Amino acid sequence: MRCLALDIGGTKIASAIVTDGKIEQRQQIATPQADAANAMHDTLANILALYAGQFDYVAVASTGIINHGVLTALNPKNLGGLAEFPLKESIARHTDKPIGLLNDVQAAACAEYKDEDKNAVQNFVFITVSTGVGGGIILERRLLTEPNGVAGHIGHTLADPNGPVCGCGRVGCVEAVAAGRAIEAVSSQWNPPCTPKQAFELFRKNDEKATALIQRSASAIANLIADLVIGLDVQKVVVGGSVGLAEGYLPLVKQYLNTMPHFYHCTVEQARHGQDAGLLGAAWWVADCLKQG
Amino acid sequence: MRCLALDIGGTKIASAIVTDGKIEQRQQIATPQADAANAMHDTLANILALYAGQFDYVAVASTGIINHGVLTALNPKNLGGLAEFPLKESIARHTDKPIGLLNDVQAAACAEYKDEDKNAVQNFVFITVSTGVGGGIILERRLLTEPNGVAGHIGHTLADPNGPVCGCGRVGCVEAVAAGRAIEAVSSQWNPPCTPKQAFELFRKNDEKATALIQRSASAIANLIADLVIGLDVQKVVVGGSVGLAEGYLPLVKQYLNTMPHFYHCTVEQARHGQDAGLLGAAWWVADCLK
Ligand SMILES: [Zn+2]
Ligand SMILES: [Zn+2]
């Protein structure tokens, strides 16, 4: 089975043929910015032409939210000229093979899940802690995507009803307490200012103020994990992203989780897939859909 | 098909034959307390005899948690002598038919979902706000139960990291700020003491202190609903229970929810099934599983 996988990001569009989880014929180009909507139709025409006859199906990971084949977002302006872009329709102009679309965190979730023992692990959550907090949720071995592609936006679940206002407008989201943006909102105000990277370095040197800031983030992620375990019977959580993978961070998350009653505990491990997670995860998911009907 | 439906509670065991969603031969007995574990094997044998040959399958709703046919709980001591009771095995002694088990809030969820237009509503949550807070979660038209029957315990998701300690041991659960037990933990300390029922009465008379207490509960339920909408793409939430159905409560929940950004919104409405929700929901779910 030959998959044309596309990974459409904020800056780069990666494309490849994926066969048996193996990547070939890589290309990377800039995500259209000038006349973005018009330009994207051209780009997609170009990509599908370049790979003509090379694929049995198309799988597309994209930042934002996929709502019935259309690119959208909680705040649509974060996508600029691609807000409400008719992604599946534009690709279908150029091929009659099946086309599956998911968002980039859902694709990364699938990349990490494909290597699991599916008999042992059927309820699985990927959390990325980066500039923001994103998630992808797999229950009974199947990714949650219906009906409108929003499932997995667990960065926007409540962390503290007295916490800061989130970028989305809700008071106290996980993302407003735990994300890199949230760490930098505090560390940038220090005298002198520090980046999140510098805050982590001080944390590893036992600076008490920097430690408090990292603990604020890690404890919020621990409480999200506990919610997922008790609300959904999640069995395993994998954590990635620049903050999620920072040295010392996941051990702190797991320390907070383990202080809670035993029925909130689950397997928590670091993400193992890198740049190609979107291509591989999207390819795995669409094939899974097709195999299942 | 003909369903023998059992609803096993902390005080009463109800049984009945359910066919085409209609109940026949409703019977109700006391939940065993003396020598409870031994006694329950007898009770179940008695019930299976009374309805012998009248059912194609058995469906059992129970308080607590169903883990691979065993009756359990987050704190199994809350079940007394029925902790870790081998429920499915005990019933299977007396019949060869299929047996499905789910917990009582999950069954209530299915009772409310059964009447929905399932083309339009596939992601559905039932929340009961009573002495505690419980839930049942349906996604893509199917109830969540795997692997260990815990899914839906959303009363133990976080409401406030600086809130009270929950009965389960976690700090700040929805249940520890929103449930009737949490309302009473505050109203019982008033001078003079008040019950939640009296707190609600004062709330409806614009007593500011009682209003703050009821608002604390409703706001926590609203934030739970928002978490489910944004985390799971839930389309409808139905709220029941003595607190949930109290006059003026759900309007207050919907008022807090509607003040959040619109992408947290969904349909929120009162529970419409009563005492038979466990029997009817369990019968519907097991039939749905049988397909
Ligand atoms: Zn938010
Ligand atoms: Zn709790």
Q: From the list A74, A144, A159, which residue is nearest B139 (CB)?
A: A144
Contact B147 A122 (CB under 8 A): yes
- Are residues B184 and B158 both part of a single domain? yes
Q: Are residues A96 and A35 in the same domain?
A: yes
Burial of B121 (0-12, 13-18, 19+ CB in 10 A): middle
Task: List chain B residues with CB under 8 Å of A223.
Answer: 158, 161
- Nearest by CB: B230 against A150, A162, A219: A150
Are the Cβ atoms of B233 and A160 closer than 8 angstroms? no
**Whether residue B289 is found in the same domain as residue B195:** no
Q: Are residues B39 and B132 in the same domain?
A: no
Among the partner residues A169, A226, A233, nearest to B151 by beta-carbon distance: A233
What secondary structure letter does DSSP report for B204?
T
Residues spanned by the domain of B110: 1-117+271-291
| Torsion angle defined by CA atoms of residues B210, B211, B217 and B222, in that order, rounded to the nearest 10 degrees | 170
Residues B157 and B210 in one domain: yes
Query: Are A156 and A244 members of one domain?
Result: yes
> Which runs of consecutive H residues, i.e. helices, occur in chain A?
36-50, 87-92, 104-113, 174-178, 180-187, 196-204, 208-232, 241-244, 249-258, 277-291
Side by side, which strands form the sheet with A12-19?
Answer: A22-30, A12-19, A2-8, A57-62, A99-103
User: Is residue A126 domain-shared with residue A260, that is, in the same domain?
Assistant: yes
Of all ligands present, the nearest one to the C-alpha of A182 is 1
Taking the CA of residue B37 and the nearest CA in chain A, the distance in Å comes to 25
Contact (CB<8Å) A227/B157: yes
* Residue B87: exposure state from Cβ atoms within 10 A (0-12, 13-18, ≥19): buried
Which CATH number does the domain housing residue B24 bear? 3.30.420.40
**Long-range contacts of B250-258, Cβ-Cβ distance < 8 Å, separation of 24 or more:** B252/B214, B252/B215, B252/B218, B253/B218, B253/B221, B253/B222, B253/B225, B254/B222, B255/B218, B255/B222, B256/B218, B256/B219, B256/B222, B256/B223, B257/B222, B257/B225, B257/B226
User: Do B160 and B188 belong to one domain?
Assistant: yes
Residues B89 and B213 in one domain: no
Task: Name the nearest CA neighbour of A277 among A90, A128, A148, A121.
Answer: A128
Rounded to a whole number, what is the distance in Å from the CA of A152 to chain B's nearest CA? 5
DSSP character string of A238-276: EEEHHHHTSTTHHHHHHHHHHTS-GGG--EEEE----TT
Task: Report the domain count for chain B.
Answer: 2
Residues A40 and A130 in one domain: no
Resolution in A: 1.9
Q: Which chain B residues are within 8 Å of A147, Cβ to Cβ?
A: 122-123, 233, 235
Q: Do B168 and B156 meet the contact criterion of CB atoms below 8 Å apart? A: yes
Whether A153 and A135 have beta carbons less than 8 Å apart is answered as yes
Q: CB contacts < 8 Å between A and B, how many?
A: 111
Q: What is the CA radius of gyration of chain B?
A: 19
State whether B261 and A140 contact (CB < 8 Å): no
Strand bridging mode A70-72 / B133-139: unpaired
B151 and B82 belong to one structural domain: no
From B23's Cα to the closest Cα of chain A, the distance in A is 31
In this structure, which ligand is nearest to the CA of B163? 2
Nearest to A224 by CA among A131, A145, A128: A128
Check whether residue A78 and residue A39 sit in a common domain: yes
